[PDB]
Amino acid sequence: MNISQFLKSLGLEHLRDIFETEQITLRVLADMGHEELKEIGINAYGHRHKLIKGVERLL
Amino acid sequence: MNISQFLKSLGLEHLRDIFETEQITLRVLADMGHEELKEIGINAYGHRHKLIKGVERLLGG
Amino acid sequence: NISQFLKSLGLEHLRDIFETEQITLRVLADMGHEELKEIGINAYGHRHKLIKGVERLLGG
Amino acid sequence: MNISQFLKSLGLEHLRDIFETEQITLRVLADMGHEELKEIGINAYGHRHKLIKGVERLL
Amino acid sequence: AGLDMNISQFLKSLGLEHLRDIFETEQITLRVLADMGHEELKEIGINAYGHRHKLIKGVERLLGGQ
Amino acid sequence: DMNISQFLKSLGLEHLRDIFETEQITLRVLADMGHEELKEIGINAYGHRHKLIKGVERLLG
């Protein structure tokens, strides 16, 4: 629901600072792919994969 | 339409001073991408994304 | 929106050219005299009103 | 009497869009202090000072 | 407190009659409006500071002041 | 790499002629100028700096 709650559900709460600094809401995240997520500092494929598939589960 | 109403609609009124100092009109904003917006001090991806998509919705059908 | 735009310039008769050519306000903003001649706006006066209209509307 | 004419007289015409978007009339501006003006985005003390003192004369 | 007044008449008196639909949809009476500040009014869609200011000061004058 | 007066006219920035004359900005000086350097000589609008930078880029290439 909130981006903090979304990350917690994927076990990715430790990524919270990137999302806060870049002002990424769960709605902004919905329009983001691998290239956009690499741009904001999500360097691990596994993390981007979890985020992309996580938004797909909802959206 | 004007920038002040445009920013308010996206909930980005706090960016009003950057737009005023840089004399950014909707015409200028329409040709701006992520690199151009970073140049004027819009450092958050989320803010640039909202601006870019906002102009797309505004000037599209 | 583009229909509202044309109406404001008294150019409502150009609605069909704009619809057929899929010209939105974003497309119109990047168009000059040569591009407008290409879609069939043959009168200078009409192209001038469109170009200056987008300039006034967008800031700008 | 027109907020646009008032702003012009103080050399603060650049502030017109904030006043229009926030629907601030001279009557509204008359009950506004430094805290209320900061709230609508008048971030410079000098600008708030000119506005407050400007309305004080218009009485 | 005597604020049993018609919200339609209240808005008209402030020159804010155009807000009639927000107040009707949200079922805002004068008694509800009396406990509302800038944050609560922003929440129901009253986005202009000037409009919220007029409403808050309008209820104050109807209540005596502050 | 001609007279600066012709360059500004081509971009519709002829009103900037006095800044360029007073600051003794030639096209070769302008070619090494970015957004920070142009802000320093009084070009406060992003749109004007953008037009100047991109204008010299086209001239060079």
Numbering used by the authors:
A (entry chain E), D (entry chain B): 1029 to 1087
B (entry chain D): 1029 to 1089
C (entry chain A): 1030 to 1089
E (entry chain C): 1025 to 1090
F (entry chain F): 1028 to 1088
Give verbatim lines from the article.
We also crystallized the TNKS SAM domain, which again required a polymer-breaking mutation. TNKS SAM D1055RT1, equivalent to D902RT2, produced two crystal forms in space group P21, diffracting to 2.5 Å (crystal form 1) and 2.9 Å (crystal form 2), both with six molecules in distinct asymmetric units. The TNKS SAM domain was highly similar to that of TNKS2 (left). For both TNKS crystal forms, non-crystallographic and crystallographic symmetry gave rise to left-handed helical filaments established by EH-ML contacts. The repeating unit consisted of six SAM domains with pitches of 83 and 79 Å, almost twice as long as for TNKS2. Unlike for TNKS2, where protomer contacts relied on crystallographic symmetry only and were therefore uniform, the TNKS SAM EH-ML contacts varied substantially. We conjecture that the variable relative orientations of SAM domains reflect filament flexibility. However, the equivalent residues (D1059T1, K1066T1, and K1081T1, respectively) mediated binding between a subset of protomers in the TNKS SAM crystal structures.
The poly(ADP-ribose) polymerases (PARPs) Tankyrase (TNKS and ARTD5) and Tankyrase 2 (TNKS2 and ARTD6) regulate Wnt-β-catenin signaling (Huang et al., 2009). The two Tankyrases are highly similar (Hsiao and Smith, 2008, Smith et al., 1998), sharing a set of five ankyrin repeat clusters (ARCs) for substrate binding (Guettler et al., 2011, Seimiya et al., 2004), a sterile alpha motif (SAM) domain (De Rycker and Price, 2004, De Rycker et al., 2003), and a catalytic PARP domain (Rippmann et al., 2002). Tankyrase polymerization is mediated by the SAM domain, a small helical fold highly prevalent in eukaryotes (Knight et al., 2011, Qiao and Bowie, 2005). We report crystal structures of the polymerizing TNKS and TNKS2 sterile alpha motif (SAM) domains, revealing versatile head-to-tail interactions.
